[PDB]
């Protein structure tokens, strides 16, 4: 569209709809209900051609941390092979993961933990 870039509230709609990307406890293969967002975000990234991504993959500090970081970051090149088969150009995109090194909220709950499983979708 007539926009380079997202402008913040897209932004924020993006990482909405990544926060609803589920994957089973240990597991980093795309789940069938995570199809529908994932078309959708395909649909976003589309309006934006020429601006670039960074696909984050974030868990809770639960388990050994060098095992988080493999997870997540398995968990974000599985939505960025997604993408890419989804018709986004492989050139816009990368994939990281950051394990449990960037919570926003505590790991001593179950919502403050199921609010630092995440992926997030950020513009570069």
């Given at each position: 569209?007539?926009?380079?870039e997202?402008?913040?509230?897209?932004?924020?709609?993006?990482?909405?709809?990544?926060?609803?990307?589920?994957?089973?406890?240990?597991?980093?293969?795309?789940?069938?209900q995570?199809?529908?967002?994932?078309?959708?975000?395909?649909?976003?990234?589309?309006?934006?051609?020429?601006?670039?991504?960074?696909?984050?993959?974030?868990?809770?500090?639960?388990?050994?941390?060098a095992?988080?970081?493999?997870?997540?970051?398995?968990?974000?090149?599985?939505?960025?092979?997604?993408?890419?088969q989804?018709?986004?150009?492989?050139?816009?995109?990368?994939?990281?993961?950051?394990?449990?090194?960037?919570?926003?909220?505590?790991?001593?709950?179950?919502?403050?933990?199921?609010?630092?499983?995440?992926?997030?979708?950020?513009?570069?």
């Amino acid at each position: 569209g007539s926009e380079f870039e997202p402008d913040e509230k897209e932004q924020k709609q993006l990482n909405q709809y990544a926060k609803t990307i589920l994957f089973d406890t240990g597991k980093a293969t795309i789940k069938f209900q995570s199809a529908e967002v994932l078309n959708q975000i395909i649909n976003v990234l589309k309006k934006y051609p020429n601006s670039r991504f960074r696909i984050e993959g974030h868990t809770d500090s639960t388990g050994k941390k060098a095992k988080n970081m493999i997870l997540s970051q398995n968990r974000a090149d599985a939505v960025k092979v997604y993408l890419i088969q989804g018709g986004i150009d492989a050139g816009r995109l990368e994939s990281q993961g950051f394990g449990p090194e960037k919570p926003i909220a505590s790991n001593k709950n179950k919502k403050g933990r199921e609010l630092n499983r995440r992926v997030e979708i950020n513009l570069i």
